[PDB]
Amino acid sequence: KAIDAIYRLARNHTTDTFMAKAIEAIAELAKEAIKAIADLAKNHTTEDFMDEAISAIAELARKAIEAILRLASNLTSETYMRKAQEAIEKIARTAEEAIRDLARNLEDQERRERAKSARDEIKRFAEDARKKIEVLALLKRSREYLKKVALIQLVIAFVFLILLILLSWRSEELIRELEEKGAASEAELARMKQQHMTAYLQAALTAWEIISKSVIALLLLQQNQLNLELRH
Amino acid sequence: KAIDAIYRLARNHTTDTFMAKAIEAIAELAKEAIKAIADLAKNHTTEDFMDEAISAIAELARKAIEAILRLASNLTSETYMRKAQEAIEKIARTAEEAIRDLARNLEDQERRERAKSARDEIKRFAEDARKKIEVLALLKRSREYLKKVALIQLVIAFVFLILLILLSWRSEELIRELEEKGAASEAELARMKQQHMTAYLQAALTAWEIISKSVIALLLLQQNQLNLELRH
Amino acid sequence: EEFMARAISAIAELAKKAIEAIYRLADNHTTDTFMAKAIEAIAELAKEAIKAIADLAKNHTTEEFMARAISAIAELAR
C-alpha cells in the first residue's frame, strides 16, 4: 500500500526535491519490506507463505525499482542518479535474494521460472545503473582533473616566463644605472653581468625542467583516463 | 509511430544538426518505450502481452538502432559517432533485456529463437560501435599527445641551445671589452673566464640531463600507446 | 504505397545502369586510370543507392519492401 501510494503520487512530481524524497521513501520501504516478507516466509515450507511472499516481493521489488529509476530518468545529474542507483541496488539485492530463496523453497516450477525472470531484471537494473554511473562519473572526473591540471601548468609556465623577463629587465636596469653614472668599473660591471646572466640561467634551466615534469603529470593522467575508457 | 516517423524523415537529412537531432530523438523514445512496454508486459503471463511486447520491441529496438547507426555512418567524427554510440547502447541494453525477459516468459520457442537473434544483434551493434570508438579515439589521443610532447620537447631543446650560445657570446663580449680597455688585470680576467665557463658548464650539464628526461617522457608514452594498440 | 515501391527500383536502376556503363568501358580498357575511375564512380553510385534503399525499406512493416531492397541491394552490391 505504501509503495503504490508513494509511486502513484511520486510519478506526478515536477521538482527535484520531491522526486528525491520519493526515491528514498520508495527504497526504504521496499527494501525493509522485502527482507522482512521473505525472512518470515523462509521459516516455513507452507505454499501459502511461499506464494504470498514470492508474488508480493516480485511485484514490490520491481515497482519500487522501476519507480525509482523512472524518477531518476528526469534527474540525470549524479546527485540524483546516484541516490536512485543506491536506492535501487539496496532494493534489488534484497529482492534478488528474497525471491531466490523463496522460489527455490517452493515445488512449483512456474513460480521458480517467473521468479528467475524477476530476479534477473532486478539485478540488472542495479548493475546497469551502477556501470553507467561509475564509469561515466569517473571519466568526467578524469577529464576535469586533467583540464584543471593543464590550466595549472599553463599558469606555472607563464609565471616562469614572467620571472625570466623580470630577470632580463633587472639586468639591463642595474647595469644601465651604473654605466650612466660611472658608478662601477668595467671589471665590476663584467662581474655583475655574469651574475645577472647566471640568475637568468638558473631560472631558465629550471623552467624547462619543470615544464618536462608538467608534461609527465599529464601523461600519467592520460594513461589513467585511457585505462578507464578502455576497460569500461 | 514516433520512431517510424522520425526515421522516415531522418534518413532524408543532409546536415549534421538535423541528423544529430534524429539520433537523440530516436533513442529517447525507443529507450523509454522499450523499457515501458516490457516493464508492463513482464507483469503478466498472458501471451497477448508477451507477443505484443516481444514483437514491438524487437522491431522498435532494431529500427531505432539501425536508424541511428546509419545516420552516424554519414557523420564519422567522434562528436556524432559518440552520440550515436551512446544513443545505441542505451536502446540496445534496454532492448536486450526487455526482449530477454519477455521471451523467456513466453512458452513459444519460436518467439524465443527469433528474440535471441534480435538480442544478439542489438547487443553487438552497441559493442561494435563501442569498441571502435574507444580504441581508435584513445589511439588518436595518444598519438596527438605524443606528437605535441615531442614538439614541446624540441622547443625545450632549442631554448637550451639558445641559452648556451648566449652564455658563450656574453663570455666573449665581457672579456673583450675589458681586454680592449685594459680595465681588468689578467688575474681578474682569468677568474672571470672561469666564471663564464662555469656558467656555460652549468647550462650544458642541465640541458643534457633534461634531454634525457624528455626522452623518458616519450618512452612512457610509447609504452602506453603500445599497450593500447596491442590490446585493442 | 507506389512512391516508396518505385523509389527502390528507381534508385537501384539508375545506379545499376551507371555502374554497368562505367564498368563496361573500364573492362574494355587496359588503362589503369580508367579502371580506377570506374572503381571510384561505382562505389559512389552503389553507395548512395544502397543507403537510400536500405533506409527506405526499413521504414515499412512488410515483406514487399524488404524483398525489393534485398534484391536491389544484393544486385547493386554484387
User: Is C73 an interface residue toward B (CB < 8 Å)?
Assistant: no
Nearest-angstrom CA–CA distance, B47 and B45: 6
Backbone angles phi, psi at A192, to 5 degrees: -65, -40
Please answer yes or no on whether B177 and A186 come within 8 Å at the CB atom: yes
Yes or no: say if B26 and B68 are a contact pair by the CB < 8 Å rule: yes
**How many residues comprise chain A?**
232
For residue B218, what is its C-alpha cell?
616519450
Please answer yes or no on whether B213 and A212 come within 8 Å at the CB atom: yes
Yes or no: say if B60 and B116 are a contact pair by the CB < 8 Å rule: no
Q: What is the resolution of the experimental data for this entry, in Å?
A: 7.6
Yes or no: say if A197 and B199 are a contact pair by the CB < 8 Å rule: yes
Instruction: Name the minimum distance, in Å, from the CA of B22 to any CA of chain C.
Output: 14
Mutate one of C8, C47, C59 to test the B interface: name it (highest B CB count within 10 A). C59
Nearest-angstrom CA–CA distance, B84 and B217: 35
Instruction: Name the minimum distance, in Å, from the CA of B97 to any CA of chain C.
Output: 23
Nearest-angstrom CA–CA distance, B32 and B23: 14
Q: How many C-beta neighbours within 10 Å does residue C76 have?
A: 21
Mutate one of B210, B212, B215, B225 to test the A interface: name it (highest A CB count within 10 A). B210
Name the nearest CA neighbour of B55 among B68, B74, B41, B71: B41
Nearest-angstrom CA–CA distance, A74 and A96: 26
Helix residue ranges, H only, chain A: 2-10, 16-41, 47-72, 78-104, 109-181, 186-231
State the structure-solving technique. Answer: cryo-EM
Name the nearest CA neighbour of B141 among B224, B44, B201: B224
Name the nearest CA neighbour of A38 among A107, A120, A94: A94
Please answer yes or no on whether B7 and C55 come within 8 Å at the CB atom: yes
Nearest-angstrom CA–CA distance, C72 and C16: 9
> Half-sphere exposure (CA, 13 Å, Cβ side) for A58?
25
Nearest-angstrom CA–CA distance, C15 and C20: 9
Single-letter residue type at B155: V
Q: What is the CA radius of gyration of chain B?
A: 33
SS3 at position B45:
coil
- What residues contact residue C59 under an 8 Å CB cut-off, 6+ apart? B4, B7, B8, B11, B63, C4, C65
